[PDB]
Amino acid sequence: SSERIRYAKWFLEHGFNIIPIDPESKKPVLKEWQKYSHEMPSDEEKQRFLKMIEEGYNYAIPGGQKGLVILDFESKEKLKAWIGESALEELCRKTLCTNTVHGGIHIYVLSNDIPPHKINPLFEENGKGIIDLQSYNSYVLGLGSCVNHLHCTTDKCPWKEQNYTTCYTLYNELKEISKVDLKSLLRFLAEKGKRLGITLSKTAKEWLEGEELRKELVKRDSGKPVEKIKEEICTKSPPKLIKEIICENKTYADVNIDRSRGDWHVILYLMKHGVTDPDKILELLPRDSKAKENEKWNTQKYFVITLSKAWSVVKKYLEA
Numbered sequence: 001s002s003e004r005i006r007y008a009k010w011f012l013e014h015g016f017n018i019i020p021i022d023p024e025s026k027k028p029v030l031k032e033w034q035k036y037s038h039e040m041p042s043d044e045e046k047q048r049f050l051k052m053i054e055e056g057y058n059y060a061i062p063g064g065q066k067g068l069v070i071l072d073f074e075s076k077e078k079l080k081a082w083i084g085e086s087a088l089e090e091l092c093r094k095t096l097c098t099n100t101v102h103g104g105i106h107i108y109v110l111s112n113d114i115p116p117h118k119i120n121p122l123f124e125e126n127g128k129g130i131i132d133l134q135s136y137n138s139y140v141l142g143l144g145s146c147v148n149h150l151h152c153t154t155d156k157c158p159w160k161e162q163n164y165t166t167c168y169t170l171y172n173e174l175k176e177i178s179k180v181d182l183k184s185l186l187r188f189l190a191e192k193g194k195r196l197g198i199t200l201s202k203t204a205k206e207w208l209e210g211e212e213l214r215k216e217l218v219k220r221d222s223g224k225p226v227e228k229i230k231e232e233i234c235t236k237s238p239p240k241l242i243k244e245i246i247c248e249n250k251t252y253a254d255v256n257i258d259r260s261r262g263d264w265h266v267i268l269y270l271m272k273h274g275v276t277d278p279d280k281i282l283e284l285l286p287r288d289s290k291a292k293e294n295e296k297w298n299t300q301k302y303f304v305i306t307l308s309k310a311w312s313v314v315k316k317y318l319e320a
């Protein structure tokens, strides 16, 4: 009750999107909840979701947004044995870690490099997943939300059909979700897991340890004239940033948004609209775009990397 609202407010205030979870159906209240893994918080939406949680809804934090992944370990006891108490305390000291309702642990981190979709499972032990990486198109239930195990069906619930309630709770204290080198954390987990037979799943390993693109971006383009694209978007009720940049011809500096963040969100929207041709994208970006306003050697690395990441994110999202 009080903790559910206290922490949802904390997340919103730190720039994180939350999504309301219907405590009757245990599922998101919103139809396209996956979009909150990658769109920008709207202040009115923030305000509405907070009120829903005050009214009794649970809430969830989607992965992907802002570089967030949540490492969702089935068993806190297992994680302690796997990495040791000292490494676990360092991790809980560096960033937010929470207890989950069925005895696991969530470790929330930001990273510059994260996968374009959840990886479920991330590590396996005796052929079975024991931790999922929650990234885009996935979420975790939020601090302060609770569950009555009387209504659990999965056999992961130790208390299935007992009238017993537990909650997502602080593992120690509340601290800001911190940035880490995720690939480096994952390599550390793998190193520590070797002696226990805890190993990266195939999908994890291929993300971690391992342009034909342009042609595929061009090939998948819609591929209308730029003027038609502007007309179509501007008559589709776009989000605030998109309206400003695509329809109102404002710069990132005009609307006082970070260049990088502006490019990222504008590019996602366009690719979701079917505008994947890099030159069309470039033409629709404002003049202070980090893809334009840069020393030229940087300009191209940045644009390629951004397009590449955006497209992998859009592809997985549509597939979701």
Ligand SMILES: [Zn+2]
Residues within 6 Å of the ligand: 102, 147, 148, 149, 152, 157, 158, 159, 160
């Ligand atoms: Zn349960």
